[PDB]
Amino acid sequence: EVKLEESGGGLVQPGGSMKLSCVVSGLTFSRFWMSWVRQSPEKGLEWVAEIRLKSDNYATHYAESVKGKFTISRDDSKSRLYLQMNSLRTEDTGIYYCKIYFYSFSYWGQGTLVTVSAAKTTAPSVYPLAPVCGDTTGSSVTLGCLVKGYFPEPVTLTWNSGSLSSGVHTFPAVLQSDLYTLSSSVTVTSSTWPSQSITCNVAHPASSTKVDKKIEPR
Amino acid sequence: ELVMTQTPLSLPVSLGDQASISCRSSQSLVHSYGNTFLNWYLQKSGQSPKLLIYKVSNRFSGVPDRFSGSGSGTDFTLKISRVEAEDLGVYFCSQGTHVPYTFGGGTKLEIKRADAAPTVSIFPPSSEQLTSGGASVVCFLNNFYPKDINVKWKIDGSERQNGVLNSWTDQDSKDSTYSMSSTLTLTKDEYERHNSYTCEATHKTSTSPIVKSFNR
């Protein structure tokens, strides 16, 4: 069972460098050609680089847009693919996938986020959203969490440590003025809350922020 | 640059129906006899692309017979029979014949279902925020269909939108609805300057708007 796993993404400033790694298991790495492909919401899927085999003398090909700035390499002995990026520009921002392919197959890793920006890492503010009149008067009520003013992107949000899974809507973050805002809702039975606690668990790894915000009634 | 053009951009279909998806290329993708490298992937929300079809018509692992690929020359088609629940997502074609490798812009599959009014919930600024000198009012509009919705904010009756941030979800896999959040962010002093706060939704399910409100 083939597994591809990208690592080493993150926040880097324009003009900066960064190296991606891609570890593959489940097949004989040295036998196959590999590529890096990136995705953006604004541009979709773009191939940037390919590397072939030892017998090929490790021939590589690149998209003209990264020629001379990107270098793809592989280590057949560790089953690892790499991408050395320098001279990064904001338009290089995206999710980077490594993939392995052949006549009969194609597999992509889970992808790693690369954010190229001059903006500073910033810890979010976490605010609890309790209703007024309260929904616990109709059988079901909806609560929320507002995670405001962070950077860069990835935060994690759970409810009751992931125990509340259903009835949850976590909205995609939106960037404005180099700061992100996100929100999430939980809908539960009115007999549930506020009698039983409901808590928003928010993490912003980049700032090592970890917040357990209890939604209290009133 | 091989150009891969797909249509439609968006394909609403009902459960049990047939979906047909088109990918056209600016040139022959025949690598060798028997080898035309056109792939079909499915990318589900927050997920990696997964191979469905390779070499135009070959089904990959676990891929049901409901899925069939075909074409040649420069016209390729993906058809899926008896469209199911988990079929939602973005379908992409790709060519592996010519370097640089290229992809279509994707086709999003949408499961049709009955119309659904949004469930509207409005929330006042928290004390934590107000203490920092800020006041965001939030409104959720959840589990509605179809996706097209409009949202207005009215303060003390007068319409007013400035410091508004909207975000929405992808189609739900289990119930085929859409949800939306709207955040109106004021400074505490401006929030304090008025009394009635209303989130107003215009959706096809209702002739009038559907609104929720509070007074501070």
UniProtKB/Swiss-Prot annotation, chain A:
S-S bridge residues: C145-C200
Residues covered by the Ig-like domain: 124-216
Cellular location(s): Cell membrane
Protein name: Immunoglobulin heavy constant gamma 2A
